[PDB]
Amino acid sequence: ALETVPKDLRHLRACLLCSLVKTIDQFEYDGCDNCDAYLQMKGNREMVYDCTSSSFDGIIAMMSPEDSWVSKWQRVSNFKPGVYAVSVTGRLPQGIVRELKSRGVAYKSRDTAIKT
């Protein structure tokens, strides 16, 4: 829905799990639109800061992941439509990753950049 689309380009942050790109206000007021139940960044700004990225390269505006080869390459075919980041710089703390793993969600990095 339109709630996922960013309002403006200032303070655009990419999530560290699903690469979801949103403004800081949208993260504060709605959290994550894909896996907030697994991260719970709504209602706490520090969780957003520790769970989102200030450095991202490339944006993909996905409408239809079910029939998109870009989603297959980016492994985001099973997520909802939105704005995602091609490359995301950052990493969750070990505590959040361990908590996700205990719930059966292994943390797979979205840093698909070629580092030299």
Binding site: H11, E46, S54, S55, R91
Partner: protein
């Protein structure tokens, strides 16, 4: 719970300091010199220093060691008191914009065409240039004949023109600029800028009446002023007690034959005397001329200064 400690940082490099500290933590999280701090905060608008979350000052000092950017906070650190840790994370908040960078900083820009690409928008600007004559500046109209005559980086397409760093103009600059490089909220230009492209004014000493309520028809002199709900303190006739009135309940009423000045409108700057106060049409004679000037009650103020109403010898030619 841990506590926040202030550490002075290089100005303009606080987010980079936070990123570097996060990388430092992740690099040494398995080694024999762990960073015992909990988090690092570099707010968006707080410039000059950052905050470190820890139970001890010694932990902060041993964690920032090797960070040159924080060397000015290395010897001593200052704790955030307890009651105030909720304020560190507290955050607040064909149109017209104003450019952020370049020589056109804080200059009015009429949004000519908005590009749905969400990268840049086309803006109409007045050029602040010297037309490549002084450099080897106030706003003035774009002169295409002058820049054609002086030469240099100039390409002409009738009324349209490219010049001096790919600046695009037509008839008036018309150039694309980044949306993040302009402000869309809080410009509110004036009538002069419209040509280029309610209100409450109570003052101390003025006389105001009451138009409605149980305290109607009480005329008093203004003491204090505030923004919207003034809660005024007017010195009424035959009343030693001070009452309360908002801006909406009051009106700038003035008795006949008292000093009057005009605050705004066509008659601004003129002083004089009111002759008869009707329900809203207040008629006055100026101190300069004996012409009838009809004003609203709100466009009148009680000032006793004499009118200004100069006369120098100048040489039209020898």
């Amino acid at each position: 719970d841990p506590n926040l400690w202030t550490v002075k940082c290089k100005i303009g490099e606080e987010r980079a300091t936070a990123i570097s500290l996060m990388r430092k933590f992740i690099a040494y999280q398995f080694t024999d010199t762990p960073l015992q701090i909990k988090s690092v905060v570099a707010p968006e608008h707080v410039k000059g220093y950052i905050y470190v979350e820890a139970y001890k000052q010694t932990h902060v000092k041993q964690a920032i060691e090797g960070v040159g950017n924080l060397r000015l906070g290395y010897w001593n650190q200052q704790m955030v008191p307890i009651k105030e840790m909720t304020d560190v994370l507290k955050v607040v908040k064909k149109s017209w914009v104003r450019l952020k960078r370049g020589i056109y900083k804080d200059d009015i820009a009429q949004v000519d065409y908005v590009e749905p690409s969400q990268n840049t928008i086309s803006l109409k600007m007045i050029p602040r240039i010297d037309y490549d004559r002084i450099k080897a500046p106030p706003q003035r109209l774009f002169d295409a004949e002058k820049i054609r005559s002086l030469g240099g980086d100039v390409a002409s397409d009738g009324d349209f023109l490219i010049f001096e760093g790919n600046r695009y103009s037509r008839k008036f600059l018309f150039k694309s600029f980044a949306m993040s490089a302009v402000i869309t909220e809080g410009v509110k230009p004036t009538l002069s800028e419209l040509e280029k492209f309610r209100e409450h004014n109570f003052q101390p000493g003025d006389n105001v009446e009451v138009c409605e309520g149980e305290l109607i028809n009480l005329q008093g002199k203004i003491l204090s002023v505030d923004g919207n709900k003034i809660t005024i303190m007017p010195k009424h006739e035959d009343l030693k007690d001070m009452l309360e009135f908002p801006a909406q309940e009051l009106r700038k009423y003035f008795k006949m034959g008292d000093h009057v000045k005009v605050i705004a409108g066509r008659f601004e700057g003129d002083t004089g005397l009111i002759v008869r106060v009707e329900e809203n049409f207040v008629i006055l004679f100026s101190d300069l001329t004996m012409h009838e000037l009809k004003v609203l009650p709100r466009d009148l103020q009680l000032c006793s200064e004499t009118a200004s109403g100069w006369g120098e010898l100048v040489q039209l030619d020898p």
